[PDB]
UniProtKB/Swiss-Prot annotation, chains B, D, G, H, K, L:
<protein>
    <recommendedName>
        <fullName>Insulin A chain</fullName>
    </recommendedName>
</protein>
<feature type="disulfide bond">
    <location>
        <begin position="6"/>
        <end position="11"/>
    </location>
</feature>
């Protein structure tokens, strides 16, 4: 896997892909 | 945190994995 | 606003949209 | 859970807010 | 709901989510 | 180019792609 | 409408242009 | 307009709602 | 069709739309 | 990581994610 | 092909790497 | 190449078509 440059919803997409049925939490600063 | 790091810099899928439940 | 089927990555995109900076959790197993 | 509420059934953008932090 | 920073196709995604079966028009400047 | 099923948010993404600056309407009820 | 043309059936990128402004 | 405002500044879902049919 | 300004995954989306069942290759520099 | 159904544009998004700079091919006919 | 492996069946992110260049 | 051109400048669907298999 390659390093990722991921902003906004692209991060959430990536988390979704990576985590699958485990799901994930999205916790941005502030 | 991961959100800011992935955007302002890069991040790996392996770092993203930490955020799975 | 409306109600629709939001699945998979679409679900998480909508979460991101609605929650944004608050962050969210996507926990499909419940 | 969210999948049943929003994918299997349908849910509003207000219901989606149930899953914000 | 939180305020949104939405460019390009992300806006169209957001409009799609917000409007549902009502649909929407996308009318950028120029 | 090809022909494919474009549904929901995918449909609007393709509209955005094809129409861009012209803008478009997405009117599922017709 | 577009949904019938493009989702239910299939449509080309040229047909999608039917819905541009 | 809404397209430029959401991108160069922010916009709310409630402002986006105005663009529904 | 209008000209496109497409970065990151947006390019891959556009290629997917344009190419359909033909598929495509994505070959960024470096 | 997990295993999930990745179809259509979602498949290509995941390819983009996994392959990035390497690039990839999306060849649905095989 | 990828569609059978990843869409029709399921595949891991590692299997997806099979289709990188 | 096409990836850099579409991002740093613009590109047409017709140029994208060249990248289909
Ligand atoms: Cl972007
Ligand atoms: Cl889908
Ligand atoms: Zn984007
Ligand atoms: Zn989808």
């Amino acid at each position: 896997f390659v390093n990722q440059h991921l902003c906004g919803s692209h991060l959430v997409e990536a988390l979704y892909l990576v985590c699958g049925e485990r799901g994930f939490f999205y916790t941005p600063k502030t | 945190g991961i959100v800011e790091q992935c955007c302002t810099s890069i991040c790996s899928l392996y770092q993203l994995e930490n955020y799975c439940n």
